[PDB]
Amino acid sequence: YADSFVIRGDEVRQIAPGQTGKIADYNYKLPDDFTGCVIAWNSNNL
Amino acid sequence: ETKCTLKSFTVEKGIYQTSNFRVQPTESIVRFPNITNLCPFGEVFNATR
Amino acid sequence: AYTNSFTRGVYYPDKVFRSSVLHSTQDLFLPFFSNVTWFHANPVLPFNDGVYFASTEKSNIIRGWIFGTTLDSKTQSLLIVNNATNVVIKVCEFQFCNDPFLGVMESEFRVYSSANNCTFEYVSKNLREFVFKNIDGYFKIYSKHTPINLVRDLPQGFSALEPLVDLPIGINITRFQTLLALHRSAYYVGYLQPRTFLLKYNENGTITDAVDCALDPLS
Amino acid sequence: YGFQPTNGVGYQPYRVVVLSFELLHAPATVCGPKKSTNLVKNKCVNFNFNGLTGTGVLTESNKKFLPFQQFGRDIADTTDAVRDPQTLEILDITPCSFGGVSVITPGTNTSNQVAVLYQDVNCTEVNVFQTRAGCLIGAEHVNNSYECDIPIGAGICASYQTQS
Amino acid sequence: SSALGKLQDVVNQNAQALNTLVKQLSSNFGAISSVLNDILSRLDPP
Numbered sequence A: 001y002a003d004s005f006v007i008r009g010d011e012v013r014q015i016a017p018g019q020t021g022k023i024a025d026y027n028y029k030l031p032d033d034f035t036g037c038v039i040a041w042n043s044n045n046l
Numbered sequence B: 001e002t003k004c005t006l007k008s009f010t011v012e013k014g015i016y017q018t019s020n021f022r023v024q025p026t027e028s029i030v031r032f033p034n035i036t037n038l039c040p041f042g043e044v045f046n047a048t049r
Numbered sequence C: 001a002y003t004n005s006f007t008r009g010v011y012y013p014d015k016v017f018r019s020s021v022l023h024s025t026q027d028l029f030l031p032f033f034s035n036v037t038w039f040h041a042n043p044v045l046p047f048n049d050g051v052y053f054a055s056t057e058k059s060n061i062i063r064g065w066i067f068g069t070t071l072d073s074k075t076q077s078l079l080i081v082n083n084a085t086n087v088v089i090k091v092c093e094f095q096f097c098n099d100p101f102l103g104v105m106e107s108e109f110r111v112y113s114s115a116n117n118c119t120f121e122y123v124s125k126n127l128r129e130f131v132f133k134n135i136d137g138y139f140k141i142y143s144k145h146t147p148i149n150l151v152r153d154l155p156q157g158f159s160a161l162e163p164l165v166d167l168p169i170g171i172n173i174t175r176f177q178t179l180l181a182l183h184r185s186a187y188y189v190g191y192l193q194p195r196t197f198l199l200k201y202n203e204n205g206t207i208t209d210a211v212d213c214a215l216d217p218l219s
Numbered sequence D: 001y002g003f004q005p006t007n008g009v010g011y012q013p014y015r016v017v018v019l020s021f022e023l024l025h026a027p028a029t030v031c032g033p034k035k036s037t038n039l040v041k042n043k044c045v046n047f048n049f050n051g052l053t054g055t056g057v058l059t060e061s062n063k064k065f066l067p068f069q070q071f072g073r074d075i076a077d078t079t080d081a082v083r084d085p086q087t088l089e090i091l092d093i094t095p096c097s098f099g100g101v102s103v104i105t106p107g108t109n110t111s112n113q114v115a116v117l118y119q120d121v122n123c124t125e126v127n128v129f130q131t132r133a134g135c136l137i138g139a140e141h142v143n144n145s146y147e148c149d150i151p152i153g154a155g156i157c158a159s160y161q162t163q164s
Numbered sequence E: 001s002s003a004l005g006k007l008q009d010v011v012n013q014n015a016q017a018l019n020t021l022v023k024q025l026s027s028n029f030g031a032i033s034s035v036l037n038d039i040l041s042r043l044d045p046p
Ligand SMILES: *[C@@H]1O[C@H](CO)[C@@H](O[C@@H]2O[C@H](CO)[C@@H](O)[C@H](O)[C@H]2NC(C)=O)[C@H](O)[C@H]1NC(C)=O
Pocket: B041, B042, B045, B046
């Protein structure tokens, strides 16, 4: 499963297994039993 | 249940502990004391001047 | 002068009821058979870890204590007073007389000369024991009033002290004093250390006896 | 400000109150109300008295605390009484019934009938026969005495006769 | 009527062991409290 989107530069630590935050508590969640990789790269030039 | 806990389709005569049992809480209650200091904000929000 | 407590300064260390049992605690107590100062009638004492404080009379010469680190302005302190009316707890920044007292006309209170920035108020022979302690911004006070059949000497016996007050102040304390009613028309000071005791509980739930477990090999 | 009653809004007087909550470093202070409820006795409930949290059945008692004492506990230090902070009455706490379940089988090579024992439970909380080992369901209590066949306990045994 | 120590000792040993078993339900073993309703009230599931 490739989940692809764009976020604010701050809550890149909000995509992680097990956490609390306004991005993680309302718009996207990962289980604490996560197994996979998370890749993030900057974008204001696109 | 006996057949499950004994892991067998045959059981022999006897008495067998199979599970536990317990009564569940019907509801919830909360208790504390009365009220004598609920603050009277009717002096700062209810002043004449 | 100095005197010897015998079994004195035991307080209920929690709110828990207990029927006929023997319960073991670790806390700050006044060790058995201790060396308690004697005062007659007074000066600035230390605090350093809680205080036992008894007193004896039929009149009322002991009229409360004053606490704190500097007993003046520039830092906060407590003040506990009793005129012939009733108790007056108070927490401001004060300016305390170096020899503060109250008279007995019956006009009095040369205690302080300043009451600034008050952060807490409150208004409303004999042997009168008190235990004062100060933990996590709370200033706890235990007390007991037993009747002696003497006038002003420290007796012998067992009597557990019941909690009175609780004040969420935050105040720092390093020193304390006393207040007396002058003449115009006896008290002791122990200190508390971390000990381990064995308290015997009655069937009504009162402490009737105790054992200090660091006195001797038998204990 | 010369305020006058015939002023357009935005020139009429407004009263303002600014609440500022501060947190120095004391031990505590003002907080919001503490919602409560009624007093249900003789049922397994989840209680909460001031912060004392547990579950069980609450009855009225014959203890007498000391005016400053707020709850009782026994040897092994389990809470077995409490004071409720509005009536000023002390209440006994009893754990909510529990136990084991055993099934009495005459052997599957003989029948499919079973009896069930609920260990040290009164019969009301579950033909039906009360022993000292618990409550027994599905077995008839005869009056004759045989040799023991399946031990139930406290002097009682069970057996498959005649068919039941 | 005025000696049964061998019978008293086996009673005492069993009671002393059963009490030690219950008195262990109030040790932390290196945790923040001894109550599960206190770790399930000031900590998130992870
Ligand atoms: C100030 O006092 C007045 C009067 O006691 C309070 O006004 C009441 O408000 C409630 C709810 O809006 C009404 O149901 C009552 O009818 C009002 N009182 C009267 C006498 O009619 C007002 O709430 C108080 N202000 C504050 C902030 O508590």
